[PDB]
Every structure is written in C-alpha cells, then in structure tokens.
Design a protein around this ligand. Structure first.
Ligand SMILES: [Mn+2]
Length: 266
C-alpha cells in the first residue's frame, strides 16, 4: 500500500477524503502543532522515509522544515498543492507570499484537484476512484460553504472588511470580494501594523476584530478597545482542532470560521 505524507493537518484531511484508504495518509505537522515553525522529530523522519509522495502547501508555509525532506525514497516527489493559485504577498504593494490559500472556497477546489492529480499519477490503477472521490468531496465542500458565501455577499459595501490578528483571511477576502485588515502577516508582530489597523478601523468604522486558535487574543482585544470595536472571538485557520473540538476536518474548519464571520457581519 502506498504512503502519502501531508505537511499538515488541513492537507492530510483533504487527502483522506480523496484517497479514502486506497493509500495510507500520514501527516507531518499534526493538529495542534504549529505549521509555521515545526521541529521535525526522529519519528517524523521515519514518516518522511516511508513517503511515496509528499504533499506540501508551498507559498513558503514549510520553509523552515523543507530541509528535512531530503535523502528521500527513490521516486518520491514533493508536490505543491497550491499550484495555479495566484499568490498574495505579505507586504503592501514584490514580497514573500502569504501562505493561507486554503481559506477560500475557490482554492479549496484547486487543493482538491492538485491532490487528485498527484494521487492519480502516483497510483494510476485507481484513477476512477480518485476521480469520483474528488468530485464528491468538492460538492460536499460547495454544499456546506456556498450558503455561507451567499449570506456574506449580502453585506453592504462599506462593511466589507475581514479584520483578524494574523493575516489569515487575505485569500478569503479576495475570493469573496472583501478587504482584509490584520495585525501581523504570519504567526511567529510590530507596533506600526497595530497603529495602522487602529487607524483603518476608525476611518472605516469597523465593528469587529478576531483572533485565532493558535495565537493570543490580547492584541485583538486591545485593538477592539482603542477602536470602540468588539472582539469577535476565535477563528480556526492554521490547524484542525482536536477531534472533539469544533474544526476536526477541513470542511468543518471552513464552515466554523466562515459561520462565525457571517454571524458577526449581521
Ligand atoms: Mn497562520
């Protein structure tokens, strides 16, 4: 049986829905661990050796541990599952890419397609099954998420703002036609970014700011105070939750976080 290693929990869950036990799906950065700065263990090195295929996000998500994907099994390729997604930069223009492409309905379909394609090239005799599974999963995502988009798109143009702590929603904003504000591009944080957000929230009368499941809520709450806005609560973006949490799957993560956003806009 072939072994397919996903770089983190979001990609692992997507792959599991497409492969459905036709391959063994493993995960490097397990749910709860930090996708942005991970220490690859010895046990992890065994997962890397066993991999017949390695599925990465790209957009520099894995940059600090790409070095561990070496001395690989003969023939094992590293696939970047964000291929075909136009990068959004971390700056305010040339700059480093924002990695959070999976927070998008459109991009969900592209992650699924790239993974379907890589599974099919790895294991061509199950092409018909990956093809079916990918369509079914794609429809499942669309059926859960599209009603949230539809609700979201009723928002008045001057209220089209996603304001968060990490810049985790820049692809969602682009996908749905919103503008995004945040306090730092990627979790790992500076004064002028905070000052800019405070000034922008006031000028545009923004009502809510979120934090996220793997970072502190303190900067968001402080910003809420200084802007006369409200703290919106915690979104799930960087990792699946634990199994009895609210976002144990990619579908659940999108649905939870987008539900929470829409319930704030109205
Ligand atoms: Mn992040």
């Amino acid at each position: 049986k072939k072994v397919v290693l996903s770089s983190f929990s979001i990609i692992g869950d997507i792959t599991q829905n497409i492969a459905k036990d036709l391959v063994t799906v493993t995960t490097l950065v397990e749910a709860g661990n930090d996708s942005h700065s991970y220490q690859v263990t010895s046990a992890d090195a065994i997962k890397i050796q066993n991999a017949d295929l390695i599925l990465c996000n790209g957009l520099h998500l894995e940059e600090t541990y790409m070095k561990y994907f070496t001395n690989l099994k003969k023939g094992t390729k590293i696939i970047t599952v964000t291929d075909g997604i136009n990068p959004i930069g971390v700056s305010e223009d040339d700059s480093e890419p924002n990695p959070h492409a999976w927070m998008s309905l459109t991009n969900a379909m592209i992650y699924i397609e790239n993974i379907r394609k890589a599974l099919t090239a790895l294991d061509p005799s199950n092409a018909k099954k990956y093809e079916l599974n990918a369509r079914e999963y794609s429809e499942k995502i669309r059926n859960s998420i599209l009603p949230l988009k539809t609700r979201i798109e009723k928002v008045d143009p001057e209220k089209r703002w996603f304001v968060t702590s990490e810049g985790c929603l820049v692809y969602l904003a682009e996908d749905f036609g919103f503008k995004s504000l945040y306090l730092w591009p990627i979790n790992s944080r500076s004064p002028s970014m905070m000052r800019h957000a405070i000034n922008q929230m006031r000028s545009h009368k923004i009502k809510f700011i979120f934090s996220e499941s793997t970072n502190s809520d303190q900067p968001a709450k402080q910003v809420a105070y200084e802007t006369n806005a409200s703290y919106g609560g915690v979104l799930y973006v960087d990792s699946l939750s634990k199994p009895d949490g609210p976002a144990p799957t990619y579908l659940d993560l999108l649905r939870f976080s987008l539900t929470k956003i829409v319930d704030t806009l109205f």
